[PDB]
Amino acid sequence: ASGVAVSDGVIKVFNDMKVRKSSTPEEVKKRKKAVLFCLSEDKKNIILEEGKEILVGDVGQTVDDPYATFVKMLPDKDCRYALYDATYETKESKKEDLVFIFWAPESAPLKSKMIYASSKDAIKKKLTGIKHELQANCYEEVKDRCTLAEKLGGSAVISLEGKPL
Amino acid sequence: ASGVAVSDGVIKVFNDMKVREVKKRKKAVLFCLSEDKKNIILEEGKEILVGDDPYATFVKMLPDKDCRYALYDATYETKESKKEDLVFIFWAPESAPLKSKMIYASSKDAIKKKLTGIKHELQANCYEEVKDRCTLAEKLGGSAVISLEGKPL
Amino acid sequence: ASGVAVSDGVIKVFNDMKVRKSSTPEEVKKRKKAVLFCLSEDKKNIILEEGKEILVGDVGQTVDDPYATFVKMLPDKDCRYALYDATYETKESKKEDLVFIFWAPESAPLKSKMIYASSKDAIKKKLTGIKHELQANCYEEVKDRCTLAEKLGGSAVISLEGKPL
Amino acid sequence: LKDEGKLLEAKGPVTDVAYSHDGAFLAVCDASKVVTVFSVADGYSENNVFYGHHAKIVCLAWSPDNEHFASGGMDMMVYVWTLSDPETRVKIQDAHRLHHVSSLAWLDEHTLVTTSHDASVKEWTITY
Amino acid sequence: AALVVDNGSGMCKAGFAGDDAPRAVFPSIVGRPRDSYVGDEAQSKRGILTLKYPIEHGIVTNWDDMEKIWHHTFYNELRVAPEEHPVLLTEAPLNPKANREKMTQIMFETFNTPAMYVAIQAVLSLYASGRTTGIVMDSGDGVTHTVPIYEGYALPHAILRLDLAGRDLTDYLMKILTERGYSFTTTAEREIVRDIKEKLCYVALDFEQEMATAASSSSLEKSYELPDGQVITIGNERFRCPEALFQPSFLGMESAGIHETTFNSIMKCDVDIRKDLYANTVLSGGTTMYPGIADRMQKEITALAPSTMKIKIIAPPERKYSVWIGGSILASLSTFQQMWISKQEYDESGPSIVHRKCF
Amino acid sequence: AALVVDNGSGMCKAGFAGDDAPRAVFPSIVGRPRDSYVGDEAQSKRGILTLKYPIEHGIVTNWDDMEKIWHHTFYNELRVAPEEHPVLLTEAPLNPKANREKMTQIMFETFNTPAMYVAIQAVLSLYASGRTTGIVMDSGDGVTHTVPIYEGYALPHAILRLDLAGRDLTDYLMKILTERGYSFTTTAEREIVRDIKEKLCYVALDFEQEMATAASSSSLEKSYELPDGQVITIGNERFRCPEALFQPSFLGMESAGIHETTFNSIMKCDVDIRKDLYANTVLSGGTTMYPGIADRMQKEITALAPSTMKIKIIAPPERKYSVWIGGSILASLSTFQQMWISKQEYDESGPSIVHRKCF
Amino acid sequence: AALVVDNGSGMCKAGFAGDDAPRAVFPSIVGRPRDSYVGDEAQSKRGILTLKYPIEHGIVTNWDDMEKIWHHTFYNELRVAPEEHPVLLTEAPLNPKANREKMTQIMFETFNTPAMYVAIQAVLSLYASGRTTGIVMDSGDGVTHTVPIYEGYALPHAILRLDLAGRDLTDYLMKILTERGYSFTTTAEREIVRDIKEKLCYVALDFEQEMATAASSSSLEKSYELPDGQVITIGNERFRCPEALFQPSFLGMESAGIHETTFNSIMKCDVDIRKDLYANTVLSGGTTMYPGIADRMQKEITALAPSTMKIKIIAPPERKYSVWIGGSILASLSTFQQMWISKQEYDESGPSIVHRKCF
Ligand SMILES: Nc1ncnc2c1ncn2[C@@H]1O[C@H](COP(=O)(O)OP(=O)(O)O)[C@@H](O)[C@H]1O
Ligand SMILES: Nc1ncnc2c1ncn2[C@@H]1O[C@H](COP(=O)(O)OP(=O)(O)O)[C@@H](O)[C@H]1O
Ligand SMILES: Nc1ncnc2c1ncn2[C@@H]1O[C@H](COP(=O)(O)OP(=O)(O)O)[C@@H](O)[C@H]1O
Ligand SMILES: [Mg+2]
Ligand SMILES: [Mg+2]
């Protein structure tokens, strides 16, 4: 336990992103499909990465593949927390679940990896109600669209984000 | 209960058919949901006049992939007496889509209970169940019926 | 299944002890109230104990409590088969039933305990028509007059051998 | 309360007991369709036994004149008993139809109030 | 000494003439594997064998199975030889004449009984209450019978049979006890529920009023201890289970209640005798032993009865075994020894002798 | 948009009206330490906590845990606020009326749902098959129900409840898989056995002939890969596990099989309608998804039924979620918007409005 | 004379009928190079070879090594020819029927035994205590079994198997002895730790109080002499090692303790026989030989069973070999010689004769 606390701006983002309240169609487009969390400059709080977010409106018009675009947002030399709203489909149902991605590449400095890993359980206990978690330590572990499918359902998942696997 | 409303023309048609000119009396009639699926309307060109095998030309009138309601004025002669009673027929083929089967089944009591006095209901879920002349006789009077539609059984 | 057979003397005694046929009052006193069975010296048959029996005539004249003196006949270092003709009374009926008691104290030698327990199913199936069975493995389990009452009818039994519980 | 060791006997399970207004008589009704009156003055001994109910008696009341009492039963009948003469009684048949009189009381020596499970209260003028 | 056997739909009561209570009361079942267990032996084996009722509604259906119950009765229960004691038997109301000839045949040939007699169950209960004219409501285990009797002669045209009885009440209590989370499914657990029914259930005078008051009643809740030490708690099911006697819709049945069945049979008699039947309604049977069932019956019948008519429901304290006790008293009388069907008379006349001597 | 929630005995199926399949299917369990984890969280939390079913046999016994499951359903599974969407709920056959009102009260007072509706699971399965008269054999996780329905009205006197279902089959497969040397004991390993049951198990038309086939060859053997990569083989256990449905004696149970329970409930109805019930036997539930179960049910019922009767077993391909699919189709109809129970109607007639609006 | 062979999960007991003790007690292992060494010879090579158990949890997994163990039993341990003496074999509870036929086929074809018999281990332990009804908690080397037996017939649906046994206790003691600085890792040092377990370990009545007692005094410490002369001291590990029986979480297992497994199997039986099982709990096996285990078992089951129930744990002083002693007495009876399966009987019927003669 490093002691890093989750900021109120991250908890509010998670609450809005988790429960989908009835809203106007122009307000549905402002929902977040993916969002990145980082550490503050003093490394005391987990804050939001400004500009590192994917809106639902962008998906399908600007963002053709939400997962491919989200992966490119991950830094290549730094650790990051992520919240991806995966829309998949199994052989029996169509599901829409939140995924907690812990990005920690081997290329990241050792200082960042220790702080992010030690405080990972502290942030995830505040983000109550999330079941799927992806721990990625390499680009290949997160670039592949399949690796999410095994985490989501396994072999049951037949489609992901509207595209067959 | 689906909540659909039975059309008022269905009740009048049943009332005319229940009581007993002859050349205009209906022997069979089909009922269907409207295009918006909120009314049990009467099919315009799917009916049989008394003046016009009456049961054969009625079964072939049933669609092969959609559910329907029907009202047949089946006539039969038992050993003791000869009688004619209306039969409510719920045609629901297995090949029909899932939504059509559910809406027709959940709204069947809406129309059947509006036609008070009906005593016979035939639930045909396949063509072999409606073409079968024996089961209709059993529904009417069981072993009492010996001849149906003027022909021996 | 030790293969020990039941002697014809035991079966004859049981048949007389079960069915009560009409007889002279001097013949009713010769009925057996409780009878003890044991293994032969060759351990091949379940013979009848010579003097270990209680007659109905002795009850009320010499034997004040038929059950109390019956327990005194059970050896404290050997296993026995017993047949007690309990005459209890419930809140709705006055009953007279046969009880099969398998005496097997923990102080008995293991050779006796093994043969008696293994051959019990053979003798019990030959004594057709018996419903109650008391499995006693210590003096405390059989000395108490109550332990018969729970086995006989349970809490419904209000009298046992003509006396209230 | 000290048990005096006195056991008055009825004909069945006691359903209601009522002392007289002057305390000179105790009337006991039971499920055996019998009303027994005990004279308090003379050693709590039985005074009279009243017959006529054909079902379990459920209620009893003493008239203010201390000479009459009324009992209602599950036979849907109410009897007003003369204490002196057990052979004279007033038969109020079906005071509340289809319902037994659950409770009853006297407004005065000539008015009898009866209630039942039909949630209605009735007053009757009793003439001897 | 003579033997008295009361063959019931669910229980067989047997004993000796002159006794106050039957010596043996065991279930009238014959079990066979899923070699043959009869009586309480079948109950002690449960799932290994299949249970069947030869007498299920008072009338014998399997004469092969009822022979084994009779053999179990004489040798295992009464522990006497049937060939040495005369036997008094009881038959259900509206018993077919063929069954009467079969019953008298089995006793004399299979069991070699010296003397025999067959009596109507309903008249034995009425006689035991000191009555000769009246209507007897015999609610047993598998069948409820309302038998109007006029000077000792049961009126066959007015006898009504209701299949609602104690057996259905046990199943109803079994079903509504699962609403509290208790699992009573196996055969052994069914006799446990029957014990709860016979100890904690009662009939409410007004079901709607009882349901309202029992919501906040501190005395309604009762605790029952299972044979294995577990404790179950029963609440408003105490008066809900016997309410199905008067409201068969609780069981899904469309039949009338016991109060209406009793009223229907009275209305099937002559207007001359209906006055005596209303004043002599005798309750008999195990299912009539609920506390408060006589008060409820009087209230319900009075509603159906004409305006000016005396309704008297008779519930003697011994009505549970009134059929047997009446038979035991009758068989023990010295003047009754001439009314036995002797074995010699059987050979001369055959099975038809029962129709003349036993009437 | 309306919500359709199917409260199963072991699995809760929830989704939105108009969808082809439920969005969320999670276990109906509430786990507490040996603070409170509901659903898949209790499964994926090690064997450090006790698991409890609020619904275990179709009837809600613990209403405090039921609210936890419903709260988990709307917020964690459906990810919606119940105060903004009407909810359609399904109830088991023979559901007590008090439980029906309690479900209505929780939705309107604890969750503040704008509108609410209750439907019977059995009638939703029958309607989805295009039928109004028939018998539904709904075999789920913790309970099996045979519900005979005639002209849209279920017959309460003939509904039979069977405790044998998929949960007992999963435990049976665990027991018989240890014979091959595969130790499945932990909660995590129980879910693996359930996957084996749902992928490799089938019902044999002739059990005794199939057992000889398995013992004389290896064509019936199949391989299953465990989550950690180990491959296990399963032979005669493929058809032995679902055979306990037709032979409950494999589990040590007293009750009859699903084929005999269906036959017993049919014979508990009127003779005029038994012919229609025999030809309209509809299968529903997860436990009815074994390949070859309709052929086995057809053969076994034909043996019990009279030879003159025609037996037809209906096994629609969507029967696994037929209750939910029917509710979703019904709740999405434009005419159903007037069939809901509003909040305004609730706080004018109380929980008793569910008996008038619904049912 | 006749041979009695009690092939256990970790130890093989063999001898002659009529003897008070088994002549040969050797480990049931077969060693192969990392040609083939069986029993004590395999233990004498340690890490040179690899050790495997043909019987590991009661049932035989590899029948090829079992034949070598039986061959070692007759010629090397018993020093007799099996073709001249009938052999009585014991089988674990819930043994597959196929294994029973394989066992008798090997005896008659491979070893040419004149006669053979197969007996259940649990019923032999219960009979040796003078009981026909009760529950036997057989805790051995590789597996723990709770077998409820009624009237000499084990109830298969209630038999519970727990993989925690003496083998897991030896490994746990090895693990916790290293905390004091004693390195016990090799095969040779494992047999030393087994000796420490069998001489210095005991079950504490109150584990938490006893744990605090050891932390404040040296009264619980004991000294043990290693084979080569060093003396090691053991303190609170004396009662920590067998505490894993009642708290399997010490070993990382999610299963319940032996007290809970015994209670769970009793609650899986019929309610009318649970009272008899509570007062007839018989302990058998080597792992039940710890001092103070009967007192701890009684205390733990009392907290689980209803307060009205009477709990009696039977721990005979000879329970370590009660299976073999019961078999030796049974086979030595002169009236048992007709219960053997003769070679002539085997030829006529085949391996299936065991299911009838041995039941
Ligand atoms: N004391 C009781 N209170 C309430 N119900 C009872 C009582 N005793 C028996 N019952 C029921 O009465 C039934 C048996 O009574 P019985 O008169 O012998 O019927 P039958 O002779 O037809 O078998 C049983 O179902 C039993 O449960
Ligand atoms: N495809 C399948 N094949 C065989 N059994 C299945 C299959 N799917 C589910 N089952 C069983 O069905 C059970 C749950 O199904 P369900 O009908 O939803 O029961 P419930 O209504 O009680 O929730 C589970 O125990 C599962 O193991
Ligand atoms: N005297 C003892 N005290 C405590 N544990 C013992 C004792 N004797 C043996 N054990 C353990 O019991 C195990 C073997 O006992 P056993 O009953 O023969 O099992 P199995 O049936 O598998 O042969 C061994 O692991 C041994 O360590
Ligand atoms: Mg009777
Ligand atoms: Mg379901």
Ligand SMILES: [Mg+2]
């Ligand atoms: Mg062993």
